[PDB]
Nucleic acid binder design. Structure first.
Lengths: 86, 51, 151, 56, 82
RNA sequence: UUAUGCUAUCAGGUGGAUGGCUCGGCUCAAGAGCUUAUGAAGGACGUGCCAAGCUGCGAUAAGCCCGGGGUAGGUG
RNA sequence: UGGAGGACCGUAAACGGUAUUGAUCUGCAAAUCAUUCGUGUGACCUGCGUCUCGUAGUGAAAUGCUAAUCUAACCCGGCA
RNA sequence: UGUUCGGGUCGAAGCAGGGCUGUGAAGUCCUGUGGACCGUUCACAAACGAAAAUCCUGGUAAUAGUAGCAGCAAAGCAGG
RNA sequence: AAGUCGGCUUCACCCCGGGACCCGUGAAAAGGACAGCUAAAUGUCCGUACCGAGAACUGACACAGGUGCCCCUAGCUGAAAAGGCUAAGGCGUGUCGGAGUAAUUCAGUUAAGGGAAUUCGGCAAAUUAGCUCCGUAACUUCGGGAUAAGGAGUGCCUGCU
RNA sequence: CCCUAACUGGAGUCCGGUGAAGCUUACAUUCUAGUGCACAGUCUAGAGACCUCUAGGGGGAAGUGAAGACCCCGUGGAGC
RNA sequence: GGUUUGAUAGAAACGGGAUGUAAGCACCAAGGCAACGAGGUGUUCAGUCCGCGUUUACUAACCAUUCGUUCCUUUCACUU
């Protein structure tokens, strides 16, 4: 079952280097890579919650937040579930 | 919705039913010697000289 | 699911709405995919698997508030005016309303007997010539020069 | 407007229709004549010696 | 010269049997009057109306609406459709 | 095992020359030589169980009838 | 008051094609695109139909246009 | 082509490579491949010999995994 | 499931009438009306799908051109069918990714002080800009020049004429 | 413009997929001078030069595009 | 350059900065009979933010691979 249940603050300042209209789906990739590296899993096993995607796309494709706070759970199968956190 | 007469529509129908592949049984009968066809075409190309 | 595109197009046709107004249940995907005919689509619609999403209109409350203020006479100043004076109030319309008011006033006066024909003719031509700004001006002139046959 | 591809977009009609007599799409819709076989001009078939070379 | 070639048996054409209509491939030379008279001679049923269209196969299709109830079913059974 | 390369040969791919074959073409000679309103030639459309082209045929539609030759296969 | 004018401004309605001597220049395009511009109730623009053509037509006239061809089009023939 | 004399399924023509001869045009032979035609004497003919024509037709390189797949127009992301 | 009512406005559509202009004085013919009512029968033939265009046409192309256009187009702002933001409807349809993603380049934003010294030339870019009010020269064919020039105001709220 | 700087989006740069065309007798890592049809990477004598790859602007290849539209000639044309 | 024998990067907090006093609440507000009311004051140098630093192993610098052997072999300095 659940292996770890950790909360993270993912910084998205490197997302700003990308051309502005690409920033939202650059930040999605940054979130997925952050979770891959910190949970020690594969890219295809990191599942991002609708809350996370909503927050990343709240202000349009050009103005994602400079950071996002998430709660990530790692299971024995290797799958990771990440949700938005207050 | 251009308006054709009976003969024009008949000739378009003939062109449409000509635009078909050679039958597989015809290919078998000719031993893969008649596989091609001069009246094959596509609708979005050089138009028919029929209408 | 395979393509539900055929089912979505048929459902939009059956509902009389746009293609994106049609909402297909993302859980009843195989139930939708089993639906082939108009009757099947109607059954899905009646059982709620397929529905037309509500039209998202354009709200008008913040325009109603502005319209109320404009009726009161605010939010309509020189810094808000952008068309010419004449495009905002046509001069023929102004003249038509003014002259019709004056003519109706003269007609009512001659009907009720305050104005005999001799002075009515001159007053009517004066009004047609623009001597009077409005019915109030006409009445003020009448009361000033005692044209009404008071009794 | 250019005499080339721009003006070539106005080509949504015809000057010649299919000929009853010869089947060629050569029947002038204005002169009511086939420029291939001569139908609508002559009871004979339209032929000239200059359609081939002088045979020598 | 019979105008009727043969009864036309597709899904939509078979849908006519439940409304007593019958669809035929007919000679494109012939008209509605000839089709009606020839069908009435062929099967002994009074024809109520004829609808006709031309297809992109170069064929002419005629839907015949009969006056006697069950005439379409009886003609289909006589032909061998049903 | 010195890569990237160069030269020659060999094996293979591509390609379709060469050779051989050919029911086609060309030229010459000898014959034969008109046809259509009793609707010609030509064209359009249709016509095959599966048939799209050509060819033949014309709603009797790759065909129908009669006489002769041919005779056991035929369905271009 | 009235509402005239080959009147005025103005639409990426329509028509035209000034300047950038910009983009493009084996192009999106055998001449187009962006911005900037001229006309925009009239000698206006435009559909469809119809007519006028090769020593001829058409031309508010540049030898412009007459099917990407014009100081005499194109096809075939004279022609090897 | 006429004519003389031949070769070939125990492997002709052609093709790739090689040996020998001849100043040479070229001839002959060997190996492999190929599967049915080919030479030779004396003569006679010609649609008879190609490295070139911005030659023609066909095939195929370098360029080169290069340019392009960028103004259209904010073009996609999450989950299933 | 309700399904009942009122009011305002109304183009760019329908009816009707008036006026002005001539300088093109602005079609013809079929058909219809003026005497028809009732009842049966008949009304054949051709087209009809779909695109009608930044992918169904045309330009050799799934071509940024061109091709009849509509006597087609909702809310706010606004003179407006301009421009902006939104409905309905149609779409994400025509290569991706990417670590500063260097230099360079196409198209843009901004730029101290100077302000055409640049250049053949103010080319390009910048300035001004709507509406209201005041005011408006030389010259003139008396029409104009004219939005000349040059000045002032403009938002929101409360209450009003 | 003095006199340029920073920034935005699209290209470019790097990666995956797709995938052309144009110059080409050959060879080719050149530079200087001379010579030569008097404007040479190839001749002559010197001087240099280890090879391969990537990016970059275009000095040269009298670069490519094209049987010079200027001039003359042709007992060649056309129009006027 | 660092890689647990660690402050390399990030999180958290704080320092140092940017902006200009957040939302809600209360009082006032020209006036309006009232409903309301642009805005002012206090809460509040607040609120929001930091592609800088410090402290701090809290997560990630883990797990490994590869060359330094010509490869197969016993043409061996070796081991089943």
């Amino acid at each position: 079952d659940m292996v770890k249940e950790q909360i993270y603050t993912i910084p998205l300042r490197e997302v700003r280097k990308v051309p502005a209209w690409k920033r939202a789906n650059r930040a999605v990739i940054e979130v997925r890579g952050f979770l891959v590296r910190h949970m020690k899993t594969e890219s295809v096993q990191v599942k991002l919650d609708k809350s996370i995607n909503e927050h990343l796309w709240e202000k349009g494709c050009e103005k994602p937040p400079l950071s996002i706070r998430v709660r990530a759970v790692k299971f024995a199968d290797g799958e990771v579930q990440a949700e938005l956190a207050q | 919705m251009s308006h054709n007469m009976k003969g024009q529509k008949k000739r378009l129908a003939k062109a449409h039913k000509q635009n078909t592949r050679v039958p597989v049984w015809v290919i078998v009968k000719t031993n893969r010697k008649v596989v091609s066809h001069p009246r094959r075409r596509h609708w979005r190309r050089r138009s028919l000289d029929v209408k | 699911m395979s393509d539900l595109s055929n089912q979505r197009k048929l459902a939009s046709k059956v509902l009389g709405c746009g293609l994106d107004r049609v909402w297909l249940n993302p859980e009843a995907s195989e139930e939708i995919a089993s639906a082939i005919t108009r009757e099947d689509i109607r059954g899905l619609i009646e059982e709620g698997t397929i529905k037309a999403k509500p039209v998202k209109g354009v709200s008008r409350g913040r325009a109603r508030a502005l319209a109320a203020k404009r009726k009161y006479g605010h939010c309509k100043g020189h810094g808000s005016r952008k068309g010419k004076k004449g495009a905002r109030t046509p001069k023929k319309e102004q003249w038509i309303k003014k002259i019709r008011a004056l003519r109706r006033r003269l007609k009512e006066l001659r009907a009720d007997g305050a104005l005999d024909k001799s002075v009515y003719c001159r007053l009517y031509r004066k009004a047609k010539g623009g001597e009077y700004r409005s019915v109030s001006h006409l009445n003020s002139h009448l009361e000033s020069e005692k044209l009404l046959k008071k009794e | 407007m250019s005499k080339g591809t721009s003006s070539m977009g106005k080509r949504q009609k015809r000057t010649h229709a299919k000929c009853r007599r010869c089947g060629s799409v050569s029947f002038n819709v204005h002169t009511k004549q086939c420029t291939s076989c001569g139908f609508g001009k002559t009871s004979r078939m339209r032929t000239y010696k200059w359609q081939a070379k002088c045979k020598y | 010269m019979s105008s009727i070639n043969y009864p036309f048996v597709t899904e939509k054409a078979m849908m006519l049997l439940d409304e007593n209509k019958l669809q035929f491939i007919v000679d494109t030379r012939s008209n509605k009057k000839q089709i009606l008279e020839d069908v009435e001679k062929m099967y002994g049923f009074k024809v109520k109306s004829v609808r006709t269209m031309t297809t992109m196969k170069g064929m002419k299709k005629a839907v015949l609406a009969f006056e006697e109830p069950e005439a379409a079913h009886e003609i289909a059974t006589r032909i061998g459709l049903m």
